[PDB]
Homo-oligomer: A and B are copies of this chain.
Amino acid sequence: GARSLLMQRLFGSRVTEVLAAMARLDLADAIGDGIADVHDLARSCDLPADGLHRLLRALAGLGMCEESEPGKFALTASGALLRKDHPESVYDFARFHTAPETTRPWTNLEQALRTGRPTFDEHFGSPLYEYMAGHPELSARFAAAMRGESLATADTIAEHYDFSPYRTVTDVGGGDGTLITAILRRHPDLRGTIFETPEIAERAAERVRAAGLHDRCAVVSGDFFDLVPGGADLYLVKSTLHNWDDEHVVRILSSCRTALADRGRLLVIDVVLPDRAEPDPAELNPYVKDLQMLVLLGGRERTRAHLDRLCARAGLVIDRVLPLPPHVGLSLTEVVPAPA
């Protein structure tokens, strides 16, 4: 009901703290595939039996564990995803989004709404990507966090978009190559390029080699404000434009239009907000993502009209917006050069 929903929302931060503790204490990996005794687990994470038992009971109450017998715990499917070693692990995603770096800025949300610029810079002393360039461990966590988030998109995009017409695809800000890898796996003849910062490009190059795609997927580093590597039939930009304000987005789309030339297409893979806000079944709430982009980066999520206008300016026109399965929350916006 109306009261239950409100009460749920209000206790959200306490629920997050319970999940944060599970992740920080690596309890998912400690439990693993079996039934674990709380007394055995207590001598793994430096908590006493009583304290750990109360935390595990909360995690069972939140659908992350099962208490088969008093003091005996197994993971649910949800709990399994917080294992470091799970094939679709969101452990790094969980650690990143519960780290002081991503949560402290939210304590100052009203200031971000008042100033219209991020509170991250005030707390940590530089813009997020400048900061991560100086903190390799956070940069590594971020790369693995974005891999975890992008799995839902990577596992669905090729069944919702026809990649067969293209010889070459370049992923602009393509992270560790999670998205392009998934596309290349389904198209053996297709050639890929990941365009990233020098720091993340190191991660992508290792991922491409480890995945055995080095023969037909290359990695190139630079600044998408400077240029996007030319020559490709298709360009992807996923979860990238929402990191930047309108003028910075135009500059990225400007670099993209130069690379598109005559027979180049751009696929913007991002939240497409409705003109009228309403509840959304996406695994991550798109309006919470919007405010995340504000406090961390001074970015935002955008409507089709808002993006259509930013395209228009870049000498680009939104051709067509294609949906993904509703749990994903992202859409595929096809962008081509404007008649002019």
CB distance from A186 to the nearest CB of B (A): 21
State whether A63 and B277 are in contact (beta carbons under 8 Å apart), knowing that A10-B16, A50-B116 are contacts in the complex: no
Q: Known: A51-B116, A54-B294. Is A61-B280 also a contact (CB below 8 A)? A: yes
Q: Are B116 and A48 in contact (CB under 8 A)?
A: yes
Residues of the B chain whose Cβ atoms lie less than 8 Å from the Cβ of A18: 9, 109, 287-288, 291
Interface residue A340 (Cβ < 8 Å from any Cβ of B): no
State whether A17 and B94 are in contact (beta carbons under 8 Å apart), knowing that A54-B113, A69-B276, A276-B70 are contacts in the complex. Answer: no
Q: How many residues of A contact B (CB 8 A)?
A: 86
User: What are the interface flags for A62-86 relative to B under an 8 Å C-beta threshold, 1 for contact and 0 otherwise?
Assistant: 1111111110000011101110000
Least Cβ distance of A144 to chain B in Å? 15
A202 CB → nearest B CB, Å = 27
Q: Which of A243-298 contact B (CB under 8 A)?
A: 273, 275-280, 283-288, 290-292, 294
Q: Does A34 contact B (CB under 8 A)?
A: no
A88 near B3: Cβ-Cβ < 8 Å: yes
**Are B279 and A61 neighbours in the complex by a CB distance under 8 Å?**
yes
Residues in B neighbouring A300, C-beta threshold 8 A:
54
B279/A63 in contact, CB under 8 A = yes
A106 within 8 A of B: yes
Contact of A288 among B11, B97, B276, B280 (CB under 8 A): B11
Instruction: Please measure, in the bound complex, the distance between the C-alpha atom of A78 and the C-alpha atom of B78, giving whole angstroms.
Output: 28
Query: Is the CB of A43 closer than 8 A to any CB of chain B?
Result: no
* A30 located at the interface, meaning its Cβ lies under 8 Å from any Cβ of chain B in the complex: no
Whether B285 contacts A2 by the Cβ 8 Å rule is no
Best-buried of A90, A103, A286, A288 by chain B (most CB within 10 Å) = A288
Which one of A9, A68, A280 has the highest number of Cβ atoms from chain B below 10 Å of its Cβ? A9
A 1-33 to B, binary, CB cutoff 8 A, 1 in contact else 0: 111111111111111111111001100000000
Interface residues of A (CB under 8 A from B): 1-21, 24-25, 46-48, 50-52, 54-58, 60-70, 76-78, 80-82, 88, 90, 93-94, 97-98, 103, 106-107, 109-110, 112-114, 116, 152, 273, 275-280, 283-288, 290-292, 294, 300, 327
Shortest 7 CB-CB contacts between residues of A and residues of B: A12-B12, A2-B77, A51-B113, A61-B287, A60-B277, A57-B277, A13-B16
